[PDB]
A paper describes a structure:
Rap proteins, named after the founding members of the family, which were shown to be response regulator aspartate phosphatases, have been most thoroughly studied in B. subtilis, where they are central to the regulation of diverse developmental processes including sporulation and genetic competence. A subset of Rap proteins, consisting of RapA, RapB, RapE, and RapH, dephosphorylates Spo0F, consequently reducing the level of phosphorylated Spo0A in the cell and inhibiting sporulation. Here we present the RapH-Spo0F X-ray crystal structure, which shows that Rap proteins consist of a 3-helix bundle and a tetratricopeptide repeat domain.
We have determined the X-ray crystal structure of a Rap phosphatase, RapH, in complex with its target protein, Spo0F, which is bound to Mg2+, an important constituent of the Spo0F active site. The single wavelength anomalous diffraction method was used to obtain experimental phases and the RapH-Spo0F structure was ultimately refined to 2.20 Å resolution. The RapH-Spo0F crystallographic asymmetric unit contains RapH-Spo0F complexes in two different conformations, reflecting different steps along the Spo0F dephosphorylation pathway. RapH forms dimers in the RapH-Spo0F crystals; this is consistent with gel filtration studies showing that RapH forms stable dimers in solution. Connected to the C-terminus of the RapH 3-helix bundle via a flexible linker and a short helix (α4) is a large right-handed superhelical domain composed of seven pairs of antiparallel α-helices. The RapH-Spo0F structure revealed that the sidechain of RapH Gln47 inserts into the Spo0F active site. We propose that RapH Gln47 orients water for direct in-line hydrolytic attack on the Spo0F phosphoaspartate-54 phosphorous atom. More specifically, this alignment showed that RapHA binding causes the entire Spo0FA β4-α4 loop to dramatically shift and flip toward the active site. The RapHA-induced conformational change in Spo0FA Thr82 is accompanied by the rotation of the Spo0FA His101 sidechain to an internalized position where it enters space vacated by Thr82. It is important to note that while Spo0F is not phosphorylated in the RapH-Spo0F structure, RapHA locks non-phosphorylated Spo0FA in the conformation corresponding to a phosphorylation-stabilized receiver domain, which is characterized by the rotation of both switch residues and the movement of the β4-α4 loop towards the active site. The entire β4-α4 loop, all of helix α4, and a portion of the α4-β5 loop are disordered in Spo0FB as evidenced by a lack of interpretable electron density corresponding to these residues.
Residue numbers in the entry:
A (entry chain A), C (entry chain A): 4 to 68, 77 to 376
B (entry chain C), D (entry chain C): 4 to 119
């Protein structure tokens, strides 16, 4: 599937040909875009940008039936709102394209230029939408303070529009997620609870299950295993009954929490259960996380399995998984006073941390 | 005549507005269900372009409420990645036609002069 | 000493009284500001804001010799550039005030509003200056990508003005520092070298010493101990001869590097040397870092001293120092296969990391 | 008459400009040394306000270069956290006076009509 940002930048190129009134080139690019979309990931925002460009493209044809500069002013002046919106999209999707190739500094620059176009748009939801999507980007970029800044602007507008409950819940998740980055799970919890309540009002089962899962993970990480297990099982129930595709993630949290709580026998039950729900189509690695739980919390640690999994993770550059699993292994070995093994895993932890950071900075100004 | 454009996205509204003004129509615009209903009640449009994909208030709900205000209402629905059952259902409720996004500007323009 | 941001927000309050034409209040606040400045840290930007406010305050008096709204338009309209600059400062210093109290989300919001005022200022250095100072803030906020974005805009403008070599060197240091955050010391090095070359051209000894020190730390962290030691000694020379106040920091890098290189006897010499240069007036903790080096790299580890130092650091919430020292201790104990001790320090490391993160997020939206 | 304002900071230049226009003077402005020298050569100001704290080119350097263009040049220096030796040195070179920042607008205004 083609990322919509990739299609967005080709539209930007299409636009360039239009503004220089090159019909042959514009037609080629227009034809290519119409093919790429047939294989593009879902993005209704991209399709809007496409349709507006189709209109702008037609304007070019209608005005060719004079210097480029002159002809350009003739078309744009009467089309202020169109020209302004196109400019906004070209910058937005260019920013997302840079973001998708991990050119973060470039992305930020486009995000900033894009925002400057918002004031010329008489629509508060459009503004919210920009802040929300950018907030997610900054979060992935681990610029968590900036993410919070933006997401708080989105949520403000969303709350003024009670019909936008979905975005409100998603905004609450983002806020909680951001707090999690600073290990302030207690600060995240209130937002997760509001999300749960809102989700139940609109009777959305998926978001009820997800909210409950998020609450459980919050408690698990804050150190309240009892509340964690309680909510995991609540999420499990709603999952098994109405949203089964969440079961693997739900059962892994439950299992991990039970293992850390010393209830490994009970955990092994949900581990085997989760392994049976996993399908080949899946794109997640819960299979490998489940296998790691079995190996490390087993009466006698399965060191070979552990090595193969960590090696597997190393291969796909899954350093976050390495850090988390290595953290667990270190604690398990410490518990039996096997400190040499422990130290070995602690070194893997510190290594994984540095490998994550290095992967976050690929530019070279 | 009067054309009511209903869509939650600024982009679509700008587009169809520029398209229908060029044809000489008197165009109205709404971002959500309530605004759309108030305009139907007050202006009584001759044709409606309704986005069935609006947050918080599904088009199915909006559609029936428009039939309440006017029975012979002329409504064309448009969708982006919309279900086939919501399209089929909308038809049974007297939908003149359905335009998938991204819709062709010419097609939807010719369809307007038709059912109008 | 009073932080200039604190004085800045009082000036903001002073401004509020002016715009509502309250002479008594404006006079009180004006009098207070003039006292605070006598005890304020150096900040020529604050003093400019003060002098402009003094002028704005006088305009108020000259126009009182009509509603507030009307009278306000009468004064502001003819004073576009003044009103615009005042607005810029009020937002800027308010952002810095929030930054200084670790209200980072608030700070960002003011930084953004402040930037929007720049386009109305016909001065490229003023723009650079904003980007530079904000870049430093984002760096301290560990929003390193955003920091890089801003600092690259500053450096661009500075390079267009060859007379601003100092800011250019400082900008290079910031860029290097940012790369360091992602453990890309190899990416930082080129900028440190350009800084060194520039510093030698302008014959600035302090920045020559600092550049050499930065290069040495870069090599030390990239794993080139020989180059590290070589540059440390270069920095040491220029220090002893022209900038002695850098000696403690220079001798600590040299010592630490020598200890990690297994040359502890040579290191102990520079450790004792650094302890003799430290003065009571100092605000740094190189004294405690020196003492930690002695304790942990000693033939027989001084565990009691180590515990007292780490406890001391804990008290002043110096979690960065705890992490670094604990990292060293863990490696030293591992080298003698004392893994129980090692594991203990690894736990202190992971703890310190989380304590740092928690201290970065004090807000509670 | 002609007043040359020399300062690297936009804020100070805006301020003194508004102050001296109010007095009816013909004001010029410079952000750095070279601009200041070009203006002295071309316009030949009757009074100069020189910021001794300018990056890359110290006021001491700028001052002598102004004495080159004109010997009877009238220059008042202003400083922010400036050394006492640079003030003392500037005086020996024929400095009419020195104004510490933040300077009082009235004081520097009265000083202008004086040495002018
Ligand atoms: Mg829609
Ligand atoms: Mg200056």
């Amino acid at each position: 599937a083609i990322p919509s940002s990739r299609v967005g930048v080709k539209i930007n190129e299409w636009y360039k040909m239009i503004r220089q009134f090159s019909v042959p080139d514009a037609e080629i690019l227009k034809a290519e875009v119409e093919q790429d979309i047939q294989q593009m990931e879902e993005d209704q925002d991209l399709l809007i940008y496409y349709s507006l460009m189709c209109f702008r493209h037609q304007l070019m044809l209608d005005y060719l039936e004079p210097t480029v500069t002159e002809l350009l002013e003739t078309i744009e002046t009467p089309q202020k709102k169109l020209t302004g919106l196109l400019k906004y999209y070209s910058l937005f999707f260019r920013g997302m394209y840079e973001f998708d190739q991990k050119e973060y500094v470039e992305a930020i620059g486009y995000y900033r230029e894009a925002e400057k176009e918002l004031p010329f748009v008489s629509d508060d939801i459009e503004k919210a939408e920009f802040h929300f999507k950018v907030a997610e980007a900054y979060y992935h970029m681990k610029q968590t303070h900036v993410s919070m800044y933006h997401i708080l602007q989105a949520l403000d507008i969303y709350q003024n529009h009670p019909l936008y409950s979905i975005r409100t819940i998603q905004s609450l998740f983002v806020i909680a997620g951001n707090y999690d980055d600073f290990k302030h799970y207690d600060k995240a919890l209130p937002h997760l609870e509001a999300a749960l309540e809102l989700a139940m009002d609109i009777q959305n089962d998926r978001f009820i299950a997800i909210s409950l899962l998020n609450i459980a993970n919050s408690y698990d990480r804050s150190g309240d295993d009892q509340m964690a297990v309680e909510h995991f099982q609540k999420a499990a129930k709603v999952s098994r009954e109405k949203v089964p595709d969440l079961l693997p993630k739900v059962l892994f949290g439950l299992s991990w929490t039970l293992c850390k709580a010393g209830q490994t026998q009970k955990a092994f039950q949900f581990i085997e259960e989760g392994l049976d729900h996993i399908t080949a189509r899946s794109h997640k690695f819960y299979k490998e996380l489940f296998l790691f739980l079995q190996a490390v919390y087993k009466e006698t640690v399965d060191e070979r399995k552990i090595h193969d999994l960590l090696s597997y993770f190393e291969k796909k550059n899954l350093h976050a998984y390495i850090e988390a699993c290595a953290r667990s292994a270190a604690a398990v070995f410490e518990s039996s006073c096997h400190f040499e093994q422990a130290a070995a895993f602690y070194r893997k932890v510190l290594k994984a941390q540095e490998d994550i950071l290095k992967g976050e900075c690929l530019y070279a100004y | 005549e009067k054309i009511l454009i209903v869509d939650d996205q600024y982009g679509i509204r700008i587009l169809l507005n520029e398209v229908f003004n060029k044809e000489g129509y008197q165009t109205f615009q709404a971002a959500n269900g309530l605004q759309a209903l108030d305009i139907v009640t007050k202006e009584r449009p001759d044709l409606v372009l309704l986005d069935m994909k609006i947050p918080g208030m599904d088009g199915i709900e909006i559609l029936k409420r428009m039939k309440v205000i006017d029975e012979n209402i002329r409504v064309i629905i448009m969708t982006a990645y919309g279900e086939l059952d919501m399209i089929q259902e909308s038809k049974e409720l007297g939908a003149l036609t359905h335009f998938a996004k991204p819709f062709d500007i010419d097609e939807i323009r010719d369809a307007v002069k038709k059912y109008l």
